[PDB]
Assembly symmetry: C2
Homo-oligomer: 628 residues x 2
Amino acid sequence: LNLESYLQPDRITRQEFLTPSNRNQCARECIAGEAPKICYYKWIAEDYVTLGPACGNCPANVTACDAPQCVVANGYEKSIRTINRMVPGPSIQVCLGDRIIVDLQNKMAGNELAIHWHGVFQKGTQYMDGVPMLTQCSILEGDVFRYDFFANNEGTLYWHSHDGLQXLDGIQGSIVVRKPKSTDLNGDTYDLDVPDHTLLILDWINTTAGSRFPGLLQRLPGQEPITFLLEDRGPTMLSSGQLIGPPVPYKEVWVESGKRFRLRLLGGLCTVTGVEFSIEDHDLTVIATDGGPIKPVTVTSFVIYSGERYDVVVNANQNPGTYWIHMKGLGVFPSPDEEVYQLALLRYSGTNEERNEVPSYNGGFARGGKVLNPQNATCAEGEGGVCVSQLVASIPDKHNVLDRKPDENIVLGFGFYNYLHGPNPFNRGIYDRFFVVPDRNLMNSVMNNISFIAPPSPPLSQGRDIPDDVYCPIGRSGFPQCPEGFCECVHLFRVPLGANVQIVMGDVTPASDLHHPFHLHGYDFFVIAMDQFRNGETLDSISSNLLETNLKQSSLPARKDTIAVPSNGYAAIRFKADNPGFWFLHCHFMYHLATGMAVVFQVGEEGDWPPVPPNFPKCGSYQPTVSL
Amino acid sequence: LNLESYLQPDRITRQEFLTPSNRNQCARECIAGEAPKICYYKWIAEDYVTLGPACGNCPANVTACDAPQCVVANGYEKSIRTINRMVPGPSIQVCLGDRIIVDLQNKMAGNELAIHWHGVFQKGTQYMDGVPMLTQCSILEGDVFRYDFFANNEGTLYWHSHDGLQXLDGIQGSIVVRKPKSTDLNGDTYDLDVPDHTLLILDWINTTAGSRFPGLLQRLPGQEPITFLLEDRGPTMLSSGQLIGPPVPYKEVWVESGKRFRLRLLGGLCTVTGVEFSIEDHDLTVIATDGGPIKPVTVTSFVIYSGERYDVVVNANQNPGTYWIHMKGLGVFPSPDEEVYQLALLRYSGTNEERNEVPSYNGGFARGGKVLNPQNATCAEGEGGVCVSQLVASIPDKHNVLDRKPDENIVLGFGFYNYLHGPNPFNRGIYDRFFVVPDRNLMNSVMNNISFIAPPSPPLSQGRDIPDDVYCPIGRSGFPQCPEGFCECVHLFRVPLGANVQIVMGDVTPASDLHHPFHLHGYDFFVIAMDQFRNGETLDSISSNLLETNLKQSSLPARKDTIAVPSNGYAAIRFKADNPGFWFLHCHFMYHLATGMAVVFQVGEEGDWPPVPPNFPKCGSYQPTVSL
Ligand SMILES: *[C@@H]1O[C@H](CO[C@@H]2O[C@@H](C)[C@@H](O)[C@@H](O)[C@@H]2O)[C@@H](O[C@@H]2O[C@H](CO)[C@@H](O[C@@H]3O[C@H](CO[C@H]4O[C@H](CO)[C@@H](O)[C@H](O)[C@@H]4O)[C@@H](O)[C@H](O[C@H]4O[C@H](CO)[C@@H](O)[C@H](OS(=O)(=O)O)[C@@H]4O)[C@@H]3O)[C@H](O)[C@H]2NC(C)=O)[C@H](O[C@@H]2O[C@@H](C)[C@@H](O)[C@@H](O)[C@@H]2O)[C@H]1NC(C)=O
Ligand SMILES: *[C@@H]1O[C@H](CO[C@@H]2O[C@@H](C)[C@@H](O)[C@@H](O)[C@@H]2O)[C@@H](O[C@@H]2O[C@H](CO)[C@@H](O[C@@H]3O[C@H](CO[C@H]4O[C@H](CO)[C@@H](O)[C@H](O)[C@@H]4O)[C@@H](O)[C@H](O[C@H]4O[C@H](CO)[C@@H](O)[C@H](OS(=O)(=O)O)[C@@H]4O)[C@@H]3O)[C@H](O)[C@H]2NC(C)=O)[C@H](O[C@@H]2O[C@@H](C)[C@@H](O)[C@@H](O)[C@@H]2O)[C@H]1NC(C)=O
Ligand SMILES: *[C@@H]1O[C@H](CO[C@@H]2O[C@@H](C)[C@@H](O)[C@@H](O)[C@@H]2O)[C@@H](O[C@@H]2O[C@H](CO)[C@@H](O[C@@H]3O[C@H](CO)[C@@H](O)[C@H](O[C@H]4O[C@H](CO)[C@@H](O)[C@H](O)[C@@H]4O[C@@H]4O[C@H](CO)[C@@H](O)[C@H](O)[C@H]4NC(C)=O)[C@@H]3O)[C@H](O)[C@H]2NC(C)=O)[C@H](O[C@@H]2O[C@@H](C)[C@@H](O)[C@@H](O)[C@@H]2O)[C@H]1NC(C)=O
Ligand SMILES: *[C@@H]1O[C@H](CO[C@@H]2O[C@@H](C)[C@@H](O)[C@@H](O)[C@@H]2O)[C@@H](O[C@@H]2O[C@H](CO)[C@@H](O[C@@H]3O[C@H](CO)[C@@H](O)[C@H](O[C@H]4O[C@H](CO)[C@@H](O)[C@H](O)[C@@H]4O[C@@H]4O[C@H](CO)[C@@H](O)[C@H](O)[C@H]4NC(C)=O)[C@@H]3O)[C@H](O)[C@H]2NC(C)=O)[C@H](O[C@@H]2O[C@@H](C)[C@@H](O)[C@@H](O)[C@@H]2O)[C@H]1NC(C)=O
Ligand SMILES: *[C@@H]1O[C@H](CO)[C@@H](O[C@@H]2O[C@H](CO)[C@@H](O[C@@H]3O[C@H](CO[C@H]4O[C@H](CO)[C@@H](O)[C@H](O)[C@@H]4O)[C@@H](O)[C@H](O[C@H]4O[C@H](CO)[C@@H](O)[C@H](OS(=O)(=O)O)[C@@H]4O[C@@H]4O[C@H](CO)[C@@H](O)[C@H](O)[C@H]4NC(C)=O)[C@@H]3O)[C@H](O)[C@H]2NC(C)=O)[C@H](O)[C@H]1NC(C)=O
Ligand SMILES: *[C@@H]1O[C@H](CO)[C@@H](O[C@@H]2O[C@H](CO)[C@@H](O[C@@H]3O[C@H](CO[C@H]4O[C@H](CO)[C@@H](O)[C@H](O)[C@@H]4O)[C@@H](O)[C@H](O[C@H]4O[C@H](CO)[C@@H](O)[C@H](OS(=O)(=O)O)[C@@H]4O[C@@H]4O[C@H](CO)[C@@H](O)[C@H](O)[C@H]4NC(C)=O)[C@@H]3O)[C@H](O)[C@H]2NC(C)=O)[C@H](O)[C@H]1NC(C)=O
Ligand SMILES: *[C@@H]1O[C@H](CO)[C@@H](O[C@@H]2O[C@H](CO)[C@@H](O)[C@H](O)[C@H]2NC(C)=O)[C@H](O)[C@H]1NC(C)=O
Ligand SMILES: *[C@@H]1O[C@H](CO)[C@@H](O[C@@H]2O[C@H](CO)[C@@H](O)[C@H](O)[C@H]2NC(C)=O)[C@H](O)[C@H]1NC(C)=O
Ligand SMILES: CC1=CC(=O)C(O)=CC1=O
Ligand SMILES: CC1=CC(=O)C(O)=CC1=O
Ligand SMILES: [Cl-]
Ligand SMILES: [Cl-]
Ligand SMILES: [Cl-]
Ligand SMILES: [Cl-]
Ligand SMILES: [Cl-]
Ligand SMILES: [Cl-]
Ligand SMILES: [Cl-]
Ligand SMILES: [Cl-]
Ligand SMILES: [Cu+2]
Ligand SMILES: [Cu+2]
Ligand SMILES: [Cu+2]
Ligand SMILES: [Cu+2]
Ligand SMILES: [Cu+2]
Ligand SMILES: [Cu+2]
Ligand SMILES: [Cu+2]
Ligand SMILES: [Cu+2]
Ligand SMILES: [O-]
Ligand SMILES: [O-]
C-alpha cells in the first residue's frame, strides 16, 4: 500500500463531512454495507506553547485564535505537549469496521510516549492498547511507533497519552466510531451527528502537570484546575463571572432551528473535578454512555468525570438566538469566590444575538429537572436524579452474564495511605512515593493496601522475562495480598478466559467529596449497583449480598467503561472476560493512577491472545552480574 | 560479588574522608600502589520538590535546611528532578583505577533517562557513555540500568542527565578521580584536597527547564537564570544585594589558617551564562583544567562556563575571619538592577566573624589582577588576562600530535537559523523546531547550516539497524553537507583510528555576547588557538593558516574537554583519535544542544571498539509494512 494515499486531515469542516471532496476521507456519514476504509494518521508529539508565534494577536484579534497551529486555551502562556500543534489533538472520525493506522513520532525532549485508545476493545490487537510496561514498551524520543487496529466497537471513544502526566499537558483527543444512521440503535433520535459536535470538556492548569507532582506544600498544594475549556478555549473567571485572564472568546456550538443534533461529550478532565453540564432552555436526550447505546432518557443536566463520555441530543426547538452552555465544576475549591466553571454559546444559524449578562458559577440551567449521574448516587424515589445503574442498554445480554451467578467476584477497597498518620517517611534514607493534596495531606494511593507499581517489561509480550517475585503474592483466599501502612507490587488478578466477573469497588478512605472514576481497559461492563455506605455496612457485606442474590438496579443495565464511585460509597460492575490479555483497571483521575490506584486483570494465558508481532520493541532492566 | 558490601554513601564528612571507618569507603586519600576498589552507587531518579516536607521550617530554621532529603536551592518552591533527593546529586569521590558501578533506577513519570560521565574517556566501555541514540537506548520509567566502567583518567570530572532538559531540573553532580598526593603532578601545591571543597556552581531558574522550551514569547522569553547556587544553596538577590527571596543561608567554605586547600570548581551551569569567580583577599593558584594538570598560574579571578572545571589552590594565609566568595554572572540580563550573581562565605576555623555589608553585583574581588579564561580572549600583551591557549600542560605530548601536520582538519561554523529572517514557518502544516530567546528571536541551532537530529537507534550498538539515509551525505569535499535556511540530519564525521585531528570552531552568527562552550566526549584535546574574528577574516582562512603553519599559542598547550569560544571568534583544538566509537561534539549550553548545536565523530569501524555487551538494550522505530 501507499499509506500516504489514506492520510487523514487533522480537522474536517461540517461541509467536508456532509459532502466529502475525497473518496478516501474517513470522517463521513457511514453507508450500510459499504467496504471499510483504511484511515492513516501521521502524528508528531512536540514540546509546544499556548499563544506564542502561531497565535499572532489572539485574543485581542479573535480570528488569530483560529490559526491551525495556535493553541489558545485560557490565554495564559505556558509550556504544553501537543499532537500536531492542537489541543485537543486531532479527532479520529471513522465508521465501524474501518482500520486505524497511526504513525506516532515522539519529538518530546527527555520524554517517553505511548497513546491509549480509551474504549477501543483491541480484541486481536492487544499489543496496540498503549499502556507502558503492560502492552508495550514506551516510545523513546527520536523513534516512531505505528499503531494498527480496527474500529470494531461503536461509539464516542477517546485517546490520550498513557505515559506519566502528559495528558493534562495536552496529549488527548476524541475517537468517534459512527454507525450508518439507519443501523444505529438510536439513529431515529437525531437528524445530524457532525464532527464539530464531538466536544471535549477539558480541565486546565496554568502550570505544567509535572509542576503539581509531587506538588508544592506551601504555595500551591494539590492538583486543582483553574478553569475548563470546551474544545480549545475558554476564559478564566471568578465565581461571579468576572474575568481574571485574557478575554479568550467562548466556544460556539452551532445548531439550526427545527433539527435535532447528536452532541458527543467527552470527559477530557484529568483532575479530580467533575462537571455538571447544562444548556439554557434546552433539555438533553441521553442516547449513549461511553459509546454504548441506551434507551433514551431526557434530563436537564448530567455530571461527567475523567474518562466518561455521554451522547445527548439537543432539539433546536427554542426561539432562535444565543443560549448559554454551563459547565459547573464539582469539587472543593480554594474559596466560594474562586469556584471553577466555564461557559460556551449555543448559537442558532441565521442569528447574531449578543448576551449581555455572564452567568455565574451558581447560574447553571439544571432548573430542578432530572440530573443524570448525580453526586452521591442521589437517585432514589423522589430525589430528582437518575443513576447510571438505573439506565437500560439498547442491546440485550448476548452471553448469559446477568442471568448466571458470577464465576469470579473481586472486591477492591481503593483509597490513600496518609503519611502524616504514621512515622515520618522523610530524611531516613528511603524513597516512598507521595503527592501533596490541597489540604496538605501527604498521600500514596492504594487498592487493598497495595500501591500499584509497574513490572520492568510488558507482560503481554515479555511475560517470560519478568521475575515472578514482582507480582503481589496470592494468599489462601485466592486473592493478591502484600508480601507497614501499605506495600508496593504488581497487583495482578488472573481470571480464566470466558469467566463471568463481578467487581465491587469501594471508597474506603473517603475525602473531599471525591467520586473516583474507575476504568477497565479492553472491555465495557454492566453497571450492577451503586450507592453510599451506611455506618456498620462493610464493602465485604455488600459484595457478598450482591453475589448471593444476583441483585441489579436495572433488568438490563447500561454498559459503561468508566464508573464514578459515589463519595463514601461503592459501585459493582459485571462483564464476560472473553477478551484475552493484560487489562488495566484504575482510577481515571491522573494523579491517582500516577500514585498507584490501579490493578491489572490477566484474562486467559499466553497462546489465548495473538503471538507477539515480528520486531515488536523489547525492554527491561540491564543489570549484568558483577564479577572480579 | 555481593555488590551491597561495596555500596558508597551519598555524602562523606571531611573527618570520614581523612580517617575512614570502613575499608570499602572509596572517598579517601589514595595510597600509591594500593589495590583498586569497587565503588557501588545505588541511585533513584525521582520527581521531587524544593523545600516541602523534608525541609521543615527551612530557612527560618537554618539547621532544617541541612536535612539529608531537603533541597533548599534559593528557597523558591518548584518541581525538580533528583538523584537520591539531593541537588547537586551524590558525588562520586574515588581514586584513579577504581571501578565505578552505578545502579540507576528511573522513577520519573513519563520521562526516559541516561546519565553521561562528563570527562571520563570510557576507552573499552564506550557503551557506558550515557548518550541517548548514540551509545545506548534511554532507560524507560520503571527500569534500572547498571553503568560499569573504570576511573582510568584523573581529575575533576562531572555527571549529568544527557536526556532532554533534566540537568537544569537537578540531575547533576561531581566525579573526583584523585591520585595519591605523592604522584599527582601538582601534589606539592596544596596540603588538603577534601570532598567538601569539590564545589559545583549551579545556575537556577524558578520554573522547570521544560517551561522554557520552546519558551514563552511575551511573558518570559529565553532561558536566563535568576540566581546561582554554590552546591545546594544561595538566596535570590538584586544587583544591589537586596534579597527578593527567602533568606536562604549563603554556602560556607571552611579553611584553616596556614594550610593550602585544593578547590575543585565545576561549571554546573546549564544556561548561556558564564560566571567570574573571585575570593576577597585570596589569590587563586590554578593547577588543573577539566581534570588535566597544568603548570600552576596565580590569578585573582577566573571565568567558567557550562561543562568546564577549574582546580584552584586557596592559601589560607590572611587574617583569620570571614571572606566573601563572589560569583558574577556574565551575560545579558533583563536590566542593570537585575544582574545575576551569588555569594558564599570563606570561613577560617576558630572564627565567627559576621560580615555586615553584602557585596553588590559589581563588588567582586578581581581587583585589576589577572583573569583566567577572559571574555573575548582578551589576553594579548598588556591586557591582564590569561587565555586557556596560553597555559602549559604538566604532561608532555606522548603521541607526536603537536609536532606533526594534522591528518584531519574539520571546520565547524556554529550558530542559529533565525526564522524571522525567512518565510513564516507556522500555520502551514509543518513542524520546524524552534526556541524563543530573550530578545524574542525564534531560533534553531546549526553547525555548517545543519541542525543535528538523532538516529532512531544508537549506532555504537545498532549500526546495522540504521538506514544510511539518516546521516548527512558526504560531498565531493569529503565533508558532510545538506541533502532552505537549514537542513536536519545525523551530522556524522568519520575519522580513522589513530588520526591526528584538528577542529576549528567559529561563532558565525554572533549574538548577545555568547561564549559557546564546545565539549568533545571520549577525549581531552590541546587548545591550539583562540581569538576574535577581524572583519574580512573567514573561518576558512584561519583554519587553512593554522593547518599549513602548525601555529600554537603555547609550546605545550593545556588539555581541556570543554572550550568557551570567544564571542564573534573561534577556537582550534587538536587530539589523537585513539579511542574508537561514536563521540558527541556539541555546545554544552543545554538549550543549544536541545536545538541541534552538535555533530558526531565516528572514530574507527565496528570491531575497533568492543563487541556489544550481552543483553544490551535495543531500540528503534516500529513501522511494520501495511498490506490489504
Ligand atoms: C456526598 O457525600 C459526602 C459524604 O457524606 C458522608 O457520608 C454519607 C454517606 C452520609 O452519611 C453523610 O451524612 C456523611 O456526611 C459529603 O461529604 C461530607 O460532607 C460532610 C458535611 O456535610 C463532612 O462532614 C463535616 O466535616 C466538617 C469538617 O470536619 C473536619 O474539620 C473540623 C473542624 O476543623 C474537625 O473538627 C473535624 O474533625 C474534621 O477534621 C465538620 O466541621 C462538620 O461538623 C459540623 O457539622 C456536622 C453536620 O454535618 C455536625 O455533626 C457537627 O457537630 S459536631 O459533631 O461538630 O459536634 C459540626 O457542626 C462535618 O462533620 C464530611 O467530612 C464530608 N466527607 C467527605 C468524604 O468529603 C458530600 O458533601 C459535600 O462535600 C463536603 C466536602 C462539603 O463541602 C459539604 O458541604 C458538601 O455538601 C456529599 N456531596 C454532595 C454534593 O452533597
Ligand atoms: C565581546 O565582543 C563582542 C563582539 O564585539 C564585536 O566584535 C569584536 C571582534 C569587535 O570588532 C567589536 O568592536 C564588535 O563590537 C561584544 O558584543 C558586541 O558589543 C557591541 C557594543 O560594544 C554591540 O554593538 C552595538 O549594538 C548596539 C545595538 O544594536 C542593535 O540595536 C540598535 C538600536 O535599536 C540597532 O540600530 C542596531 O542595528 C542593532 O540591531 C548598537 O546600538 C551599537 O551602536 C552604537 O554604538 C556603536 C559603538 O559601539 C556606534 O558605532 C554606533 O554609531 S552608529 O553606528 O549607530 O551610527 C552607535 O552609537 C553597537 O553597534 C554588538 O552588537 C555586540 N555583539 C554581540 C555578538 O553581542 C561584547 O560586548 C559586550 O556585550 C554586548 C552585548 C554589550 O552589552 C556590550 O556593552 C558589552 O561590552 C564583548 N564582551 C565584553 C565582555 O567586552
Ligand atoms: C487578525 O488576524 C488575522 C490573521 O492574521 C494571520 O494569522 C495570525 C495568527 C498571524 O500569523 C498573522 O501574522 C497572520 O497574518 C488577520 O487576517 C489576515 O491578514 C493577512 C494580511 O494582513 C492576510 O494575509 C494576506 O492574504 C492576501 C490574500 O491572499 C495576500 O495577498 C497577502 O500576501 C501578500 O500581501 C501582504 C500584504 O498584506 C504582503 O505583506 C505579503 O508579503 C504578500 O505579498 C506578496 O504578494 C505576492 C503577489 O504577487 C504573492 O505572490 C506573495 O506570496 C506575497 N509575498 C509573500 C512571500 O508573502 C497575505 O497573505 C490573511 O489572509 C488574513 N487571514 C485571515 C484568516 O483573514 C487580520 O487582518 C485583518 O483582516 C484581513 C482580512 C486583512 O484585511 C488585514 O489587512 C486586516 O488587518 C487581523 N486583524 C487585524 C485587525 O489586524
Ligand atoms: C530546627 O529544626 C531542627 C531539625 O528539625 C528536624 O528536621 C526538619 C527538617 C523537620 O523534619 C523537623 O520536624 C525535624 O524535627 C530541630 O532540631 C531537631 O529537633 C528534634 C526535636 O524537636 C530532634 O529530635 C529529637 O531527638 C531526640 C534525641 O534523640 C529524641 O529524644 C526525640 O525523640 C523523642 O522525643 C520527641 C520530643 O522532642 C517526641 O516527640 C518523639 O516522638 C520521641 O519520643 C519517643 O521517645 C522514645 C524514648 O523512649 C523513643 O524511643 C521513640 O523513638 C520516640 N518516639 C518516636 C517514634 O519518635 C527526637 O527524635 C532532632 O534531633 C533535632 N535535630 C537536629 C539536627 O538538631 C530544631 O529544634 C530545636 O533544636 C533541637 C536540638 C531541640 O532542642 C528542639 O527542642 C529545638 O526546638 C529546630 N529549631 C527550632 C527553633 O524549632
Ligand atoms: C493561572 O492559574 C493560577 C493558579 O496556578 C491563578 O492564580 C490564582 O489567582 C487567584 C485569583 O486572582 C488568586 O486569589 C487571589 O489572591 C490574592 C492574594 O492572596 C494572598 O494575600 C492575601 C492578603 O493580601 C491573603 O489573605 C491570602 O491568603 C494570600 O496570602 C487575594 O488578595 C485575592 O482575594 C481577593 O479577591 C477574591 C476574589 O474576588 C475575594 O474573594 C477576596 O475576598 S476576601 O475577603 O476573601 O479576601 C479578595 O477580595 C478583594 O478584597 C479587597 C479588600 O480586601 C477589595 O478591595 C477587592 O476589590 C477585592 N477583589 C476582588 C473582589 O476581586 C484572591 O484570593 C490566587 O491566590 C492565585 N493562586 C495562586 C496559587 O497563585 C491565576 O489567576 C491564573 N491566571 C490566569 C490568567 O488564568
Ligand atoms: C523566581 O524567578 C522569577 C522569574 O522566573 C522572578 O520573577 C522576576 O522578579 C523580578 C524582581 O522582582 C521582576 O522585576 C520587577 O518587575 C516589576 C513589575 O514589572 C512590570 O510592571 C511595570 C509597571 O508597573 C513595568 O514597567 C514592567 O515593564 C513590567 O511590565 C517591576 O515593578 C520591578 O521594577 C522595580 O524594581 C526594580 C529592581 O529594583 C527597579 O530596577 C525598577 O526601577 S525602574 O525605574 O527600572 O522601573 C523598579 O523600581 C521600583 O520603582 C518604584 C517607583 O517606580 C519605587 O517606588 C520602588 O521602591 C522600586 N523598587 C525597587 C527599587 O526594588 C521589577 O522590574 C521580574 O518582572 C520577574 N520576572 C518575571 C518573568 O516574573 C522571581 O522574583 C523569583 N523568585 C524568587 C524568590 O527567586
Ligand atoms: C488494609 O489495612 C487495614 C488496616 O489499616 C485493614 O483494616 C483493618 O482490618 C482489621 C481486620 O484484619 C480490623 O480489625 C481493623 O479494625 C481494620 N482497621 C481499619 C478498618 O482501620 C483492611 O482490612 C485492609 N484491607 C484488606 C483488603 O485487607
Ligand atoms: C551556510 O549558509 C550560508 C548562507 O546562508 C553560507 O554563506 C554564504 O556562502 C556563499 C558562498 O557559497 C556566499 O556567496 C554568501 O555571501 C554567504 N552568505 C552569508 C555568509 O551570509 C555558508 O557558507 C554556509 N556554510 C557552509 C559551511 O557551507
Ligand atoms: C485525599 C485527596 C486526594 C486528592 O486528590 C485531592 O485533590 C484532595 C484530597 O483530599
Ligand atoms: C541568539 C541567542 C541565543 C540564546 O540562547 C540567548 O540566550 C540569547 C540570544 O540572543
Ligand atoms: Cl474533526
Ligand atoms: Cl484475541
Ligand atoms: Cl493552576
Ligand atoms: Cl465523610
Ligand atoms: Cl561527598
Ligand atoms: Cl576500545
Ligand atoms: Cl526563572
Ligand atoms: Cl557583533
Ligand atoms: Cu483513558
Ligand atoms: Cu482505557
Ligand atoms: Cu481516584
Ligand atoms: Cu488506563
Ligand atoms: Cu557534560
Ligand atoms: Cu561529555
Ligand atoms: Cu551554544
Ligand atoms: Cu554531551
Ligand atoms: O486510561
Ligand atoms: O555533555
